[PDB]
Amino acid sequence: KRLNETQRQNQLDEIKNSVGLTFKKKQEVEKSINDSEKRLKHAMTESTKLQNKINHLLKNRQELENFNKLPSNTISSENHLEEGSALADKLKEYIDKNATLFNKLKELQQANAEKSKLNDELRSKYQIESSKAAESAQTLKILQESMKSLENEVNGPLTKFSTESQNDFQSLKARNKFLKNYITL
Amino acid sequence: FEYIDPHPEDPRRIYRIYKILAENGLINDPTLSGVDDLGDLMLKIPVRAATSEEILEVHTKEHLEFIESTEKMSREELLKETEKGDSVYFNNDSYASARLPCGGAIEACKAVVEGRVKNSLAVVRPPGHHAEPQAAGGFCLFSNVAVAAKNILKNYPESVRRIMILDWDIHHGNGTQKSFYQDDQVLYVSLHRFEMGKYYPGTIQGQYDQTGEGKGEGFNCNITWPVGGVGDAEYMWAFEQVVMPMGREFKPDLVIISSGFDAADGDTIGQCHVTPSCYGHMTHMLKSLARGNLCVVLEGGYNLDAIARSALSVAKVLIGEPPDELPDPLSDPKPEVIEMIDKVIRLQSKYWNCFRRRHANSGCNFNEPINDSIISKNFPLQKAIRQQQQHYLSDEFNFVTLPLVSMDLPDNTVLCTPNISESNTIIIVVHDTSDIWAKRNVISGTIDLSSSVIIDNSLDFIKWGLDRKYGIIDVNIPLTLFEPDNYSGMITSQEVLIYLWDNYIKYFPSVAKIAFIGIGDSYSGIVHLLGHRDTRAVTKTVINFLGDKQLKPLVPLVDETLSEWYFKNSLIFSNNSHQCKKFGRVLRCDTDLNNIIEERFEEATDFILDSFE
Amino acid sequence: RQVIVPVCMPKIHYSPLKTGLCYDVRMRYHAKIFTSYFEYIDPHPEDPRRIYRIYKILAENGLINDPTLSGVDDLGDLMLKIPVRAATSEEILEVHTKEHLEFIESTEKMSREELLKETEKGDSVYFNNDSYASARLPCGGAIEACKAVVEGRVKNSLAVVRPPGHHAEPQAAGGFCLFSNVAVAAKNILKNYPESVRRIMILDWDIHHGNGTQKSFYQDDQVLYVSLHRFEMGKYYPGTIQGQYDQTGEGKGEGFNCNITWPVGGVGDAEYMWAFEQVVMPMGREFKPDLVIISSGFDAADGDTIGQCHVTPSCYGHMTHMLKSLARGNLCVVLEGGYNLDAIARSALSVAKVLIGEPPDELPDPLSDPKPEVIEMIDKVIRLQSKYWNCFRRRHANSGPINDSIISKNFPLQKAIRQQQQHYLSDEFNFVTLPLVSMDLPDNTVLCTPNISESNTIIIVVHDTSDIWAKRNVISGTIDLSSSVIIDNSLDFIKWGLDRKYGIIDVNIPLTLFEPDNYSGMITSQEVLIYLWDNYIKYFPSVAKIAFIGIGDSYSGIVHLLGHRDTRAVTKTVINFLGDKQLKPLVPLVDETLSEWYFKNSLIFSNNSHQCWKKPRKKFGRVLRCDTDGLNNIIEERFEEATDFILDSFE
Ligand SMILES: [Zn+2]
Ligand SMILES: [Zn+2]
């Protein structure tokens, strides 16, 4: 019973340690996902501004192209479209990595949320069993009591036949203020 | 989800210490589970649940009803009792977890007294040095040691009658003290940080003058570490100074320890530096003290490595191995520590015999509270000095008193020439009490009156300025008076200076050229008032006969040219064995306090007259 | 189920071993030669009989397994035998000169009478034909015990060894030693192990001075020499200035020699406890030795006729315990003295039990309150050693000449106390200041209860100015004056008498400043006493049952009033609380039966440490010796016996 008890108690210890671990790891990735979201905001402002470049310079393309007399502005315009697309590619890869960070946070959070209640349940049923453990211990205690009373009685000056019949000082003879405690006139 | 930072009262504390011994061959139980066949140096003792009779010997019935009722409470009710206990957490399984420490304690103690083991150790939790007989408090549910000790005394009236309970747990043993605060057969001591409300628990019961009550007087002790960061020095120091003489005086039949290694080196709730070798050497002294009777109970320790190493050292000392060597035998403990231990040994001399005639305390008896009445034979002496000078100056130069109203100081603290409000020039001598040179008798502490050499050096400038027809302001700040035990000269001086400057000196019609003289350490209060107010309008200069005292660091609170004006208008004569911009013209004087006063008076008075023109 | 920490051996160093023992029957034949019948009635200064008496007491307690009591190798379970071998001349010459080796060499091959003249000639020594090999064996046994301890063959050793070696000097022998055993072994270990054994701390509690061992390392810094003994320079052996406490080394060994001298014999448990508690442990931990050698001597034990001390065998165990705490576990014990075989037997038994590992017992008397002389003696030692070591500075205000012209400028302090005194007296007891006209004295010399001319019982209490207890600060030097108290000592009696409706008269007489004995006070006392008696006492009609109370001095006035008048008809008791003062002899002039009435109706309480009883006469008048010192203590102590004799003396 104490074998199973100590296994469950070490189990409970490892559980509480693990809840600490998961909430710890989650709490540290919070600030990471926060900064990642801020760079995502920056990257979205970047997309918007690059699209404003795309829009005004495509307007200017339309202004110059009909019955051409072709200036060099349309090549720069198309180059700005390429820059906006490349920056869009970059922010898209980035929001993907951002999403990876966020979902790992969320699953860790979920594990952390269920772990506490799991610990509480193990605690509850641990109390249920440990009650019966304690009372059974008390039964074995009174059994010990019975055995030593019997044995102590039969051991000393004993009944009329010898068919069956110091160090360490058990017979209250530890000489630290015992005999000298008596009156002795 | 605060499981990142769990509770300092933790289950691992038992298991960790149990592990450490099995790593050193002391325990030959490999699986770290409670068995009987431990090994050859020690002997395992079973732990049983304490009955209701044992646990109600000290505790009240309502307490047991509450702890028995909460054993099958609902979850939210447990939450309410957890948040309701003063840092005590309650949970579904709480009756047996609290009734097993007390039972284990009585087991270990009965094992020691019946001579079946040489001594015993009880790695145990929850603690019991914070549980009170009517309410739980401080991570503790039932006072284990009180239950155990009352069982030993009531059930063994033939071999044990006096017991010592020690608490080197850095938190004061609140619960274990009040149960035996009226008790005389037990001498309780607690080494702990006290820090007057700051440290845990921070209640009036933790003060160093809680020496028992009723017939329990002189049979209770609190050692109150003023500042954190004490180490092996102060521990061994207090052990030799207070513990061991009174220990060999009281002579117990049993010594019990409510130990805690929350003050061990490397701990966080304690923040102290007691190495486990200091633990082993104090354990050695306690082994020397009694005839061998010892039991240890675990209360503190919330750093697993500190408590584990400390426990391993103490366990080696317990098996029979002598103590190892300390980190530093040349450490020279803190002055405040020495003064606190002195004030302890004072009242202990007032009670016990072993601290007088070997510590020069047999002269006067401190059991008479020092009074001017006839109830006590003792009489204060600074009162006599001040009364003599008051009578003297009153019939002599008609020196009137200035009532320092709304402050707790005698009428003749400030002495003044009459009509001080019309003095065109006001000299303000912020002086200090005289000094003697004689040989104190080492056996009694009493002195001689036929060769007493006391000089009233602070009267020279008074008569000098009196001849100048300058208004003289004599102020007497004494040095702790030996009576109140909490008088602080510096802060009181600062208050008197603020008070007089804001209530009287700022209103005077003909006030001009206020000088300032400070003799000895009594000059630092001037630094406060100068730094806190703009006074240089009427102030011309400031003079200091520092003697051998350390310099006073001027930090100004109103301007920065105070330091310039101060350093320009300050002469601060110092010791020749002193050698030590904001200090204000440190002058390393030649002859040596009285020496530099009668020698540099001429320099002082002449610079006064030139600055005054 | 998982085995996490595999089973291992215990990791300890102290007590898997046994306690080393050096013993040999080959060192009990260096004996004296018969000279006179006086030798039959004297304690035989260094007798061979010391060995087997202790050795017999050992086997009776099971610590060694030997019912035959002879040299074996199976010493049992708690102790290990260490064989002895004759030390070669090289180890001996490590300390001594070359003429002393040849001296003991020549000594071996002498006749009987030349050895007799050598016994007579030596500085308290005696030679023998078997005194050459029997002198080489001690040093060898000592070196074997130290090698056994240092090389860890035993946890510690103990050596039952004679002749001594703590008196033999490097130059020549003197002091019942032949070869210096401690010095030889110490120098051979420092020469044999100067990597592990680098600092040695030698201690001496033998009541003679270890003069030879002092000189051997007086210029040595690796060897901390400490000696505790009685000096008594005039008579007490050795009678050398090397035994004086100021021998604190020389050269590089400065601060590495220490003599601790007892001003007087009679010392017990509390003295040695207090001393070992205060001094030896800080300098020992600061000196940090790698080996502590013990020069044991049980010639100052309880039951010894030469030491005349009363040290019990428990304190020995306590000191052994402390020394075991001091070092790293390495300890060696060599025996030097002893005169009474039973005391040395029980003491060596206790020391050996503590050495095996048993804890020291509790002392038979924890309360003796040590004699005043040794206190200031150790203060002076602390001054020197604070100058040398640091652990006595900054904690005892030592940190390693007042004036003679400012004496004209002094704060009076007699009249101030008497004035304040007068004040609080009159404000609670309404005393009448009595004017002694035609006499130049302070107005508050005498204060009496009002309507003194009608009270029959008149108690006249004469005393000097009151006592003062002051606090000296420990942080830095001098005394703190503002933290001083006025010990009014004569207050319980005035109140006591007023509770029984008596005429109470207070008398103060000030002290002659800068004066050893208040002789002018005694003169002024006789003036006040005679004058008051003539001018005032004989004119009050209703007077009966006068009792006097004297505190300290001023009792010459009472002595003069008794001898030079006849006033015993109305007074019935004189009482002085002398304390420590010198005795005032009564000089009777009116008649002689006045002196016996004086001697009869008297009670005087003088201190334990007073000049007498170390036998006064009857002209002092039946003094009594208190058990405590101090005037305040004895007055609060015997306040009840005094009022009992007063009420018994009256109706
Ligand atoms: Zn605590
Ligand atoms: Zn000797």
From Swiss-Prot, chain A:
Coiled-coil boundaries: 23-184
Top-level lineage group: Eukaryota
Subcellular location(s) of the protein: Nucleus
Protein family: Belongs to the HDA2/3 family. HDA2 subfamily.
Subunit and interaction comment: Heterodimer with HDA3. Component of the HDA1 histone deacetylase complex composed of at least one HDA1 homodimer and one HDA2/HDA3 heterodimer. Interacts with HDA1 and HDA3.
Additional record remark: Present with 1500 molecules/cell in log phase SD medium.
Protein purpose: Required for activity of HDA1 histone deacetylase complex. The HDA1 histone deacetylase complex is responsible for the deacetylation of lysine residues on the N-terminal part of the core histones (H2A, H2B, H3 and H4). Histone deacetylation gives a tag for epigenetic repression and plays an important role in transcriptional regulation, cell cycle progression and developmental events.
Stated name of the protein: HDA1 complex subunit 2
Underlying gene: HDA2
Residues of the full protein shown: 446 to 638 of 674
Curated annotation (Swiss-Prot), chain B:
A GO CC term assigned to this protein in UniProt: histone deacetylase complex
Xref: Pfam families: Arb2-like, Hist_deacetyl
SUPFAM superfamilies named among the record's database cross-references: Arginase/deacetylase
EC number, UniProt record: 3.5.1.98
Catalytic activity: N(6)-acetyl-L-lysyl-[histone] + H2O = L-lysyl-[histone] + acetate
Annotated signal sequence range: none
Keywords tagged on the record: Chromatin regulator, Hydrolase, Nucleus, Repressor, Transcription, Transcription regulation
Annotated catalytic residues: 130
Swiss-Prot/TrEMBL GO biological process terms: epigenetic regulation of gene expression; negative regulation of transcription by RNA polymerase II; negative regulation of transcription by transcription factor localization; positive regulation of transcription by RNA polymerase II
Subcellular location: Nucleus
TM spans (from-to): none
Region (Histone deacetylase): 1-320
Molecular function terms, GO-annotated: chromatin binding; histone deacetylase activity, hydrolytic mechanism; identical protein binding
The keyword Repressor is annotated on this UniProt entry: yes
PANTHER family listed in its UniProt record: HISTONE DEACETYLASE (PTHR10625:SF5), HISTONE DEACETYLASE HDAC1-RELATED (PTHR10625)
Similarity comment: Belongs to the histone deacetylase family. HD type 2 subfamily.
Additional remark text: Present with 3050 molecules/cell in log phase SD medium.
Job of this protein: Responsible for the deacetylation of lysine residues on the N-terminal part of the core histones (H2A, H2B, H3 and H4). Histone deacetylation gives a tag for epigenetic repression and plays an important role in transcriptional regulation, cell cycle progression and developmental events. Histone deacetylases act via the formation of large multiprotein complexes.
Name of this chain's protein: Histone deacetylase HDA1
Organism this protein belongs to: Saccharomyces cerevisiae (strain ATCC 204508 / S288c)
